[PDB]
Design a protein around this ligand. Structure first.
Ligand code: SF4
Ligand SMILES: [Zn+2]
Lengths: 714, 77, 185, 93
């Protein structure tokens, strides 16, 4: 299927594709043509993916001198695994269309937790454990011990890869993580290191956003060689929050206690070294005096001489001084305060620790830790985090704040004080991506208005287009319920949120909807407290019994294992005749991780506008900074994030394969003129006055009709 | 249970001519008849059948000198 | 409070765990379908065609020349109950219940006797049910004439031999099958 | 697969309860003046087609089979001519 795209005729595998795909491709092409970044939105995942790959591949085949490589990033590995299979399918078509093989290579990267084959780490399942052992297995001392040929458990796959795998680069093809592991097993080469090396001889690379946002991993993959390469985000609607979160760090009482235990372990190691030999380790002292990896970005990090910290004793003393000050500053009993400059100024005043040596805390730590021949970093991790935090806060804080909380999060009060170095802007943190790469494309679904993004992120969008699904039938049906059958407003106002009538209206609505919606249905709540309160209220009433009697019900919690089992049971219940109902919190990890498909979340219910507790210090610092620095109003951004998060959790009902789904919003707020404008265009245009202010009964009636209309073939 | 025997009582009231022949075939000895057979509350019970704890608890703590509604109360209280 | 959610989800989990136990149309000779069971001078056609054309010279004749009371009465009398064209009992009552008793008995007995009678089945257990069925046929043949004698002596009129014919025919099938089996053996 | 099938003939009393054969129907069964039989069951039946209550063989009349032959002789669709197409036959045939 040759597509008459604006720039060139593009070969495509499927004989038929929808009109919006042509627009999306020819629109995205503008970013290539204009040699600049842009933003756009498209509901379908697979369609926009395959069309993106086709467009960029054809463009790359047409202009290989202009674009050397394509960098694609997506939400998670399970999605990446499907995308890379779609690329293979596209390449298989292209090879069949061309009739011959071409020098093209594409691969997906992943952490050593998944992308590993060594027998000793294979029984390990925690990422830090696998990484710590892998690092130890690949460590220079283990390599040296291996070169000594003494009895040693070593990574034969690494030695054979360094010897042979490095000597011969893989010629061409597409290698999925499972296929890359099998390849590594067959070749006897480390899949992770082989993939990392293959980046040097590959045209397409796939990894998640944190492989691009965290500078340690991102720098190794975003080298200057990619000075004229294109990077594309496919579902980074929360790129700001992920970026800020990747920059933010949390310190706690137990963290400091672990750091102290680690510090005592370092001291014991220094003693063991001093009693054995320190002169050999002083070989590092020369390069240090001459002048895991730090999270500091390319332009922020420098190989400057570490300063007064010139010995292990100095570093350990300097670390002791800081740890004591941090513990002291953390254990202080007072209201939550923000000291962005004052913490550093306080550190200089209270313990006379200057930012200059402190800037090299992580640099010296890794150097010292390496020379110390430590077993593994897994246990030292809290101390490394403290050292990373220390260098980070001492280097720059323009886009950060220090928050001190007498108690742990998620709890009203606990005798475990915590400190946060909360980040507040994505622009400066993501700046290297836009500065180095020639084009950046922000693609996503459930994407709230685009013009807010150029404010939160520093970019000059070449494209500003919002696409809507084009089909012979309205496969998606958004609807907003604003009134309960009890002739009462169903709005989730903060004071009205706890109203028994609204709670009852949601229960009656869910009872009826769960009875009429086939297979799997899902409902999102604002928070566990309201959810439990709501469930408890429904349990005191007959509502919860009638619901469970009509269909099985499952509820999500903070526990990943319990929610995973419950979700698997929910899905298995949907496979069988029993069917199931899934209740979850919109902000819950399950909502950002789960993908909804036909009969698996066929209908998604949103109870109220998802507004986070506005008294939370994190929100306060973030929101005031956006107003002070980026000039965005408090209610503007707070509503934008609520609209975005609602659409994100609710819009996931449509993912691909042209399967129908229902999206009901139980709040008249969504029907307001501003909220409607903040709603994504595809939802906004399918939404209409007939379904904009439906009564609970009207919602059930329109849903039942829509289900009847969707059951027949196209 | 003596279902083999009970089936006679079950069919004694379900169909009289069927049972009358079953008897006359033996009373008048028309054929060897033993060959015949070779050819031819919900609250507690639903909970007991559904939950392992009640399943085991009811087996050991089966109602004796008490009212079943008391056992129901002991569960939901 | 969380126990309610935990219990409700345990319940749904236990309910689920309890619900998990450990060719185009083808033809070669279609004309034969047109007939079904239906089974199977040239000048006379021309003569009949010409003669009928001259017979069609007279039309719309007089009803009183077309028909007559003699012809009409002959038809009505023929259609009368005593005529050539007009073609035109629960006397015993206690026998009614006896017949039902016998019909139910014979019906029950014959289902078993025929259960494996028409199939050849040259196997030990399948052949033994044949023999066991025949022995049972020899057993019913003892008691059935005794009931017949009662009917015959009590009625001595309006005999009911139909019931007996099912038995006699089963014996004809018995002797034919037995002789055929011995012949095939 | 092929199937063994029985094609009995309905039989009646000769004339107004004369040379009759008193019997009840196999389907409180009433007396049968006339009815079908089975070569093996020799039991009289009032309604056909039916499976043998004894032999387990289907008894049926020949027209019942022909009632299905339209499935074997699917009718060819007639070509549409919605316009008059100068067809001189004003009357539908
Ligand atoms: S060197 Fe390769 S095989 Fe060995 S632990 Fe690391 S990733 Fe796994
Ligand atoms: Zn028969």
């Amino acid at each position: 299927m040759k597509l008459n795209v604006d720039g060139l005729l593009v070969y495509f595998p499927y004989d038929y594709i929808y009109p919006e795909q042509f627009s999306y491709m020819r629109e995205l092409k503008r970013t290539l043509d204009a040699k600049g970044h842009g933003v756009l939105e498209m509901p379908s995942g697979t369609g926009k993916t395959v069309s993106l790959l086709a467009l960029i591949m054809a463009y790359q085949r047409a202009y290989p001198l202009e674009v050397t490589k394509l960098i694609y990033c997506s939400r998670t590995v399970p999605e990446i695994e499907k995308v890379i299979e779609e690329l293979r399918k596209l390449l298989n078509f292209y090879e069949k269309q061309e009739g011959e093989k071409l020098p093209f290579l594409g691969l997906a990267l992943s952490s050593r937790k998944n992308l590993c084959i060594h027998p000793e780490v294979t029984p390990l399942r925690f990422g830090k454990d696998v990484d710590g052992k892998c690092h130890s297995l690949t460590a220079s001392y283990v390599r040296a011990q291996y070169q000594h040929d003494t009895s040693l458990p070593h990574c034969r796959f690494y030695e054979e890869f360094d010897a042979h795998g490095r000597e011969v680069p893989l010629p061409a093809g597409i290698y999925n993580l499972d296929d890359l592991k099998a390849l590594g097993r067959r070749q006897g080469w480390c899949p992770y290191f082989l993939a990392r090396y293959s980046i040097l001889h590959a045209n397409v690379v796939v990894y998640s956003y944190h492989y691009l946002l965290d500078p340690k991993i991102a720098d190794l993959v975003s080298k200057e060689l990619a000075r004229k390469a294109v990077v594309v985000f496919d579902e980074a609607h929360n790129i700001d929050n992920v970026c800020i979160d990747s920059m933010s760090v949390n310190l706690t009482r137990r963290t400091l206690d672990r750091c102290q235990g680690n510090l005592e372990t370092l001291q014991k190691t220094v003693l063991r070294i001093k009693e054995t030999d320190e002169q050999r380790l002083r070989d590092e002292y020369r390069r240090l005096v001459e002048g895991a990896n730090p999270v500091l970005p390319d332009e922020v990090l420098q190989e400057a001489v570490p300063g007064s910290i010139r010995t292990a004793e100095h570093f350990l003393g300097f670390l002791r001084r800081l740890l004591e000050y941090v513990k002291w500053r953390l254990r202080v009993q007072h209201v939550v305060q923000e000291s962005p400059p004052a913490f550093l100024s306080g550190l200089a005043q209270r313990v006379c620790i200057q930012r200059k040596p402190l800037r090299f805390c992580a640099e010296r730590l890794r150097s010292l830790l390496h020379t110390l021949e430590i077993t593994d970093l897994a246990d030292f991790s809290p101390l490394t985090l403290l050292a990373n935090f220390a260098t980070l806060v001492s280097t720059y804080a323009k886009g950060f704040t220090i928050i001190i909380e007498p108690f742990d999060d998620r709890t009203p009060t606990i005798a475990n004080p915590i400190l946060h170095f909360s980040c507040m802007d994505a622009s400066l943190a993501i700046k290297p991506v836009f500065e180095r790469f020639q084009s950046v494309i922000i693609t996503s679904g459930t994407l709230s208005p685009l013009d807010i993004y150029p404010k939160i992120l520093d970019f000059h969008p070449v494209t500003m287009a919002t696409f809507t699904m084009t089909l012979a039938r309205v496969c998606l049906c958004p609807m907003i319920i604003g009134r309960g059958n009890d002739q009462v407003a169903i709005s989730s106002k903060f004071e009205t949120r706890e109203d028994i009538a609204v709670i009852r209206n949601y229960g009656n609505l869910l009872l009826e909807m769960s009875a009429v919606v086939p297979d799997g249905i899902v409902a999102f709540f604002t928070s566990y407290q309201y959810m439990e309160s709501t469930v408890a209220s429904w349990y005191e009433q007959g509502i919860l019994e009638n619901i469970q009697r009509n269909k099985l019900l499952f509820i999500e919690t903070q526990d990943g294992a319990e929610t995973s089992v419950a979700l698997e049971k929910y899905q298995e219940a949907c496979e069988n005749g029993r069917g199931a109902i899934l209740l979850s919190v919109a902000r819950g990890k399950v909502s950002e991780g789960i993908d909804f498909v036909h009969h698996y979340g066929r209908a998604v219910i949103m109870f109220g506008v998802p507004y986070v507790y506005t008294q939370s210090r994190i929100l306060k610092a973030r929101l005031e900074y956006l107003r002070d620095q980026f000039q965005i109003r408090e209610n503007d951004f707070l509503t934008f994030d609520a609209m975005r998060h609602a659409a994100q959790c609710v819009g996931r009902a449509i993912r691909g394969k042209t399967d129908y789904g229902l999206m009901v919003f139980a709040d008249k707020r969504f029907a307001r003129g501003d909220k409607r404008g903040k709603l994504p265009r595809w939802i906004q245009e399918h939404l209409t006055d007939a379904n904009l202010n439906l009564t609970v009964d009207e919602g059930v009636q329109v849903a039942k009709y829509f289900l009847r209309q969707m059951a027949q073939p196209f | 249970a003596n279902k083999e025997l009970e089936e006679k009582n079950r069919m004694l009231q379900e169909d009289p001519v069927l049972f009358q022949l079953y008897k006359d075939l033996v009373v008048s000895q028309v054929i060897s008849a033993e060959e015949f057979w070779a050819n031819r509350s919900d609250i507690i019970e639903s909970i007991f059948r559904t939950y392992p704890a009640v399943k085991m608890k009811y087996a050991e703590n089966v109602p004796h000198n008490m009212t079943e509604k008391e056992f129901w109360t002991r569960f939901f209280q | 409070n969380a126990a309610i959610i935990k219990r409700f989800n345990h319940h749904s989990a236990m309910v689920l765990a309890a619900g998990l136990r450990k060719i185009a149309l083808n033809l070669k000779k279609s004309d034969r379908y047109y007939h079904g069971p239906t089974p199977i001078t040239s000048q006379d056609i021309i003569n009949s065609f010409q003669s009928i054309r001259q017979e069609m010279e007279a039309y719309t004749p007089k009803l009183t020349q077309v028909l007559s009371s003699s012809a009409a009465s002959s038809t009505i009398t023929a259609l009368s109950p005593g005529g050539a064209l007009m073609q035109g009992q629960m006397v015993p009552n206690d026998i009614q219940s006896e017949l039902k008793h016998l019909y139910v008995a014979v019906g029950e007995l014959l289902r078993h006797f025929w259960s494996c009678f028409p199939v050849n089945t040259p196997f030990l257990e399948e052949k033994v049910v044949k023999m066991k069925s025949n022995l049972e046929r020899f057993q019913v043949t003892k008691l059935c004439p005794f009931q017949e004698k009662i009917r015959r002596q009590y009625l001595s009129t309006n005999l009911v031999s139909h019931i007996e014919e099912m038995l006699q025919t089963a014996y004809n099938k018995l002797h034919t099958w037995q002789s055929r089996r011995l012949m095939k053996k | 697969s092929l199937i063994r099938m029985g094609f009995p003939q309905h039989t009646i009393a000769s004339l107004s309860d004369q040379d009759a054969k008193p019997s009840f129907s196999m389907a409180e069964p009433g007396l049968t003046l006339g009815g079908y039989f089975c070569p093996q069951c020799r039991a009289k039946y009032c309604e056909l087609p039916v499976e043998c209550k004894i032999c387990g063989l289907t008894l049926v009349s020949a027209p019942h089979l022909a009632r299905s032959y339209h499935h074997l002789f699917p009718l060819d669709a007639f070509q549409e001519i919605p316009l008059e197409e100068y067809n001189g036959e004003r009357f539908c045939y």
